[PDB]
Amino acid sequence: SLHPSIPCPRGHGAQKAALVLLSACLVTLWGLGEPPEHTLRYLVLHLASLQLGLLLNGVCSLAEELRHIHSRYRGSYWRTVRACLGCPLRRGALLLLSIYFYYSLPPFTWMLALLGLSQALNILLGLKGLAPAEISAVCEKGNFNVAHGLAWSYYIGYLRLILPELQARIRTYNQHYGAVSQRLYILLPLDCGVPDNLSMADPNIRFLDKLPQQTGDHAGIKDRVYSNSIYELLENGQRAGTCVLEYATPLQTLFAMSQYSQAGFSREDRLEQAKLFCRTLEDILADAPESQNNCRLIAYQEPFSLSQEVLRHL
Amino acid sequence: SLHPSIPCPRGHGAQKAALVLLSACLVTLWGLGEPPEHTLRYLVLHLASLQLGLLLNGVCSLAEELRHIHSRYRGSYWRTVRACLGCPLRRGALLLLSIYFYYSLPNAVGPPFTWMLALLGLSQALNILLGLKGLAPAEISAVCEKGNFNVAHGLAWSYYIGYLRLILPELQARIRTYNQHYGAVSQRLYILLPLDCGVPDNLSMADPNIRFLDKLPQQTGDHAGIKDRVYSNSIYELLENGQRAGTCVLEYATPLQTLFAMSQYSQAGFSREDRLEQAKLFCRTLEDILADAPESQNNCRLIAYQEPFSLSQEVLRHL
Amino acid sequence: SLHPSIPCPRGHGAQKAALVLLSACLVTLWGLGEPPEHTLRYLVLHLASLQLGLLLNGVCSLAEELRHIHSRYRGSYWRTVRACLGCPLRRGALLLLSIYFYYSLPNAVGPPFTWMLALLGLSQALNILLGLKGLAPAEISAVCEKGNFNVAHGLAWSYYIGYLRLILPELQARIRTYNQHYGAVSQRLYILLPLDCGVPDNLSMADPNIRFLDKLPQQTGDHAGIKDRVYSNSIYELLENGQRAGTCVLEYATPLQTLFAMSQYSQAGFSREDRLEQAKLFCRTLEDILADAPESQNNCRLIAYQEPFSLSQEVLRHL
Amino acid sequence: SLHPSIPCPRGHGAQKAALVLLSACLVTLWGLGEPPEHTLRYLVLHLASLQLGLLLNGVCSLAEELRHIHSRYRGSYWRTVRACLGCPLRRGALLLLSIYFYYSLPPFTWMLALLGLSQALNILLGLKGLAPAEISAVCEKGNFNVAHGLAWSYYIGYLRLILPELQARIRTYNQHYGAVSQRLYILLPLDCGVPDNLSMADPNIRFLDKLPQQTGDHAGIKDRVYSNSIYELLENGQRAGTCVLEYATPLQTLFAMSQYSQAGFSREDRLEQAKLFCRTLEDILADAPESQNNCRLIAYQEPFSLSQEVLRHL
Ligand SMILES: CC1(C)C(=O)N(Cc2c(F)cccc2Cl)c2cc(C(=O)NCc3c(F)cc(F)cc3F)ccc21
Ligand SMILES: CC1(C)C(=O)N(Cc2c(F)cccc2Cl)c2cc(C(=O)NCc3c(F)cc(F)cc3F)ccc21
Ligand SMILES: O=C(Nc1cc(F)c(F)cc1C(=O)O)c1ccc(-n2ccnc2)nn1
Ligand SMILES: O=C(Nc1cc(F)c(F)cc1C(=O)O)c1ccc(-n2ccnc2)nn1
Ligand SMILES: O=C(Nc1cc(F)c(F)cc1C(=O)O)c1ccc(-n2ccnc2)nn1
Ligand SMILES: O=C(Nc1cc(F)c(F)cc1C(=O)O)c1ccc(-n2ccnc2)nn1
């Protein structure tokens, strides 16, 4: 519910489609009025072909990966073989079953050579690639996303370091001094726009003062200084509200990555990873122990006044 | 060059192995003496069956990608179909070839076209439902490396852009000002890259031979909506047998500490093996960036090390 | 959307036409009713012959690319072979398939393997020597657009990086300083893009209704080894029936003037048709850059026009 | 002679290889001792098939380009057809000749349909692409290079306006002021690494003075000013030469383009276009009327002191 454009996690629509396809194929096989022992024989033979093709692809991948045995696989052949062929025991059982089914069910070495040729063509010309939807699904399942690491690092390195101390500093500033809200408002620009000043993003927002700076050592730096800025959110020139505004710096860096050529990062990838960053940041703040209603994410996309949105969240 | 354990980028060993396999298969087909027409016919029929299976798998995936059309594909069906089934025109041409060459060509090993379609749909549905069509870790790693689908890629580019790209231009001026106003501190930034991702908050606890000495002048600058953000780096000293061997500006790579924390947290879905791989990828990507970046022109150095030891000796060796 | 005559980027009409042609050819092959095995056999034989012709052409090209190995290919033969013949592994696999599927398969229309190779080498040599295997200007334009092999692409990116990326950040401050200390000058730099590339040195001669009014404060900055390079922009006023209708920071795009000069010079190898194509492409590329660039945010406006007229009326209309 | 790594223009090595291949093919046809009427028939049929395939490819390209008729082809169908099919008259003559030879020489519509299918596959899957060497040769022949336009624009827009009066400015400065050279030394770093100051590139080069600025209108800007800088060249810490040093700004922008992701410009392309820029700029200055031994290009590659190179060129 952060923003309507944020993608929801993938469910089981592909599984439902596969179930429907399985049902339809069973219905049409029954309706063909043709003996089912041949059906089972063909199905077993086809799965055997798929298993042997996977074996050959994994053997080629193993030939590639045996150079990285000391680097990625800590100098062990077993981990390399597991990486390139899945579980060795189950894969071996399936390959022996497939070999037996070919050598038993009614040539074989000719089919084996031709299947090896097909697998070689698949590897060399890239026939069996990966569609963008498949890559996205695999990355989201295995958390192989730039945004996942970026948002978890934003939470661990910054947010959990300040949030309770930030509430304490807000209380101290209020009692010393138009009270400021006791929460850090972090803006998430989905599409674009991450100026170094809130005034540049919107002149209606004006820097008011600075919170009592927090100085604590963090990752090899003695007395690291945190300086959070209070902003007045005005409305027709009057102080409608005031609170601690901030921008999610990993979003700025996602934009910068999309700018650089060496990053291998595209505008579509930039927007997608910004959406995932916001999604997983909200997801981990929901279950965070530090987040105790002392942090508010304001996700927005420019089609617009930021100050009105911040007041709406206030 | 940072560390021997950091893996080199993937080469073309798989393609060379595939070429050798193709040559062996061609030699075997020539030796067996089977008619070449049958060999070509069955090869084309196999490729057609694979293409039709890809069609069915793409349709099944489109069944679940169609409800993310507004959120992920800007509400356009063409982008969804392109993401699921690939390029619509090339995929359509390939499926037209597959249909024509299976409906027409004879097939002794394989059922007629309607029976083939039923059986291939059955097998593809089984593969999708049971998860039989899966990717081994090596293929997933290769795809992620080619497509930059790593947490380490983003983390290293973020360490560059968000932190290094800000202090590196002014670090030389700050060190010169410190030297003039007040041994001599080195002019290079020494980023420590522990491959074990053990990053103490206080660097003194890492090794007693490094003790905090002083602080560089604070660099005040606006950044991402924080007015007057303060960068207060630190100047440390290195002790050899208790004597002041050298001084430097030492710190750790914060993304490595966040990687370790992710490996600690359960919700992160991050494992120790994944932690080590992404630490090495972060180090490699940062090294490549600094090699290509114009800001780091003899201005920053990276200390990559693995605990099997004293950090002070390694830093002095790099001095 | 600058001008109607500026061409849109090339779409996929060729691929759609190819798909329609493929469908028609498949329908025709079904209609005649020749054995499908013969169809597949002859298609594979034709593709094999094409691949072997590509091999021969690549070898002939490698004969001339081998003497630029040190200058162009850093002295390594692998880059030369990759440039000439493509990817060595994929090309080798395709060549092995072609050789096997021609020497093995029967062929009623076509010679035996050695006779085919001799005749195909003869034909490829004839194509290379007589220049028969040439590219029509449409394919050359498509390849140049896809690969950014245009003078206009580099010229537009150079106008952005070398000039606009330097004055646009401080243009607002300069105009504000001028306004405070002195009608009111507009806050946007108006870059005129004449598609005829007629760029007068003195903009007054283009149309008398535009007249120079004053000069913005000089921007002094280092750039490309020129110490204290001075950008002295000028402001113009726009007249309507002799009255001061408006005032703005108006200037021309110098790369268009250089394009016109290239069309004038004989050694440039630049024609009037090429001049017009590259002018329109420069306008399109600059528009795309300014749309994507962060420097241009309500700071610069492009006035693209073609003489069939008064420039002042167009600039006022855009005002 | 500007730099050893500068590529020389492509010669006729491909033509010589084609001639050798033609000779070897003639020898082997004579060697097989097999009748030449069948040889001529096969050759004519092969060229006819190639011509028909080119016709089909051009028809597909015409279907693509017919929507750019008003933009690129001035709203005339004849220009679009010429662009997509070459010369209409010669192409038509060749197609009628090929059709007649294909039909007359001992099916036809079946072969035509199969050739159309092959051409459709070539277009859709991109079998008949363009190798990097072929693209480079075509671009060099047709001057479709970024560097060509960049260097011609550098000559016309900058050098053509300062070179005539640079000698007068230098003479005036020398009279008012230990003699500075009467040539503009332009540095051409093949790595496109240009600092904004010569001191940053090499601290042994120090800024000496400023030439009397040249003020003249240029391309819609009244009284555009040029401020050339005289630098100091030092050897062993003492003055050894004084000259007007400058960097080729198109090389700066080539580097910047290689940096930006939107440019579609790579590092290999950056180096190649830097080399072509230097080559064609040296070619332009060889016949430029303005260049009267009042301009010297300096090309170098960092494996080295720039000041020593400038002294060597002095
Ligand atoms: C390369 C070679 C000789 C080969 O090794 N196989 C594996 C294989 C089978 F797939 C099927 C039976 C035996 C073998 Cl032994 C193959 C298959 C075809 C073919 O027509 N497959 C259609 C097809 C099916 F037959 C069953 C099915 F469930 C789905 C399906 F889509 C053509 C050439 C080959
Ligand atoms: C698609 C289809 C049916 C077709 O339309 N042609 C055109 C054509 C010729 F190219 C050659 C002769 C007749 C026809 Cl009619 C074709 C050719 C082959 C083939 O085997 N070409 C080898 C080959 C040669 F025969 C002569 C040569 F100088 C070089 C060469 F490389 C296979 C299938 C076809
Ligand atoms: O790593 C840092 N920052 C970031 C890293 C990211 F990966 C990112 F995506 C965003 C940032 C960011 O903060 O902008 C960082 C490190 C040290 C200090 N520092 C040194 C002295 N005092 C403070 N400040 N920042
Ligand atoms: O994003 C930040 N940090 C990091 C983000 C990462 F993704 C990471 F991997 C490491 C860090 C890190 O520096 O520890 C960050 C943001 C704002 C401020 N801040 C606001 C006012 N004063 C200081 N400080 N740090
Ligand atoms: O177009 C310009 N420059 C360039 C264009 C390129 F395509 C390139 F490759 C490099 C340059 C460059 O000079 O750096 C340009 C235009 C106007 C003024 N100017 C405005 C007021 N006074 C002077 N100055 N420069
Ligand atoms: O490169 C320059 N100009 C251009 C280059 C182009 F490629 C182009 F298409 C247009 C121009 C142009 O501005 O006319 C240039 C370089 C140095 C100085 N300069 C040196 C001292 N003071 C001023 N002025 N101009």
Author numbering:
A (entry chain D), D (entry chain B): 5 to 110, 116 to 186, 192 to 317, 323 to 333
B (entry chain C), C (entry chain A): 5 to 186, 192 to 317, 323 to 333
Give the original sentences from the paper that presented this experimental model.
Its adaptor function is activated by cyclic dinucleotide (CDN) secondary messengers originating from self (2’3’-cGAMP) or bacterial sources (3’3’-CDNs). Here, we explore the conformational and oligomeric states of full-length human STING in the presence of closed-LBD (SR-717) and open-LBD (diABZI-3) non-nucleotide agonists, lending insight into potentially distinct modes of activation.
Local refinement using a mask around two adjacent STING dimers yielded a final reconstruction with a global resolution of 3.1 Å. Two copies of SR-717 are found in each orthosteric site in the LBD, with the ligands and surrounding protein displaying near two-fold symmetry. Furthermore, the carboxyl groups of the ligands interact with the side chains of H232, R238, and T263 via polar interactions. Overall, STING bound to SR-717 adopts the canonical closed position. The lid, comprised of two beta strands from either monomer, is fully ordered above the ligand binding pocket, allowing H232 and R238 to interact with SR-717. The α2–α3 loop in the LBD undergoes an inward displacement necessary to allow for backbone interactions from Q273 and S275 with the neighboring STING dimer to mediate the formation of high-order oligomers. The SR-717 complex induced an angle of 26.4°.
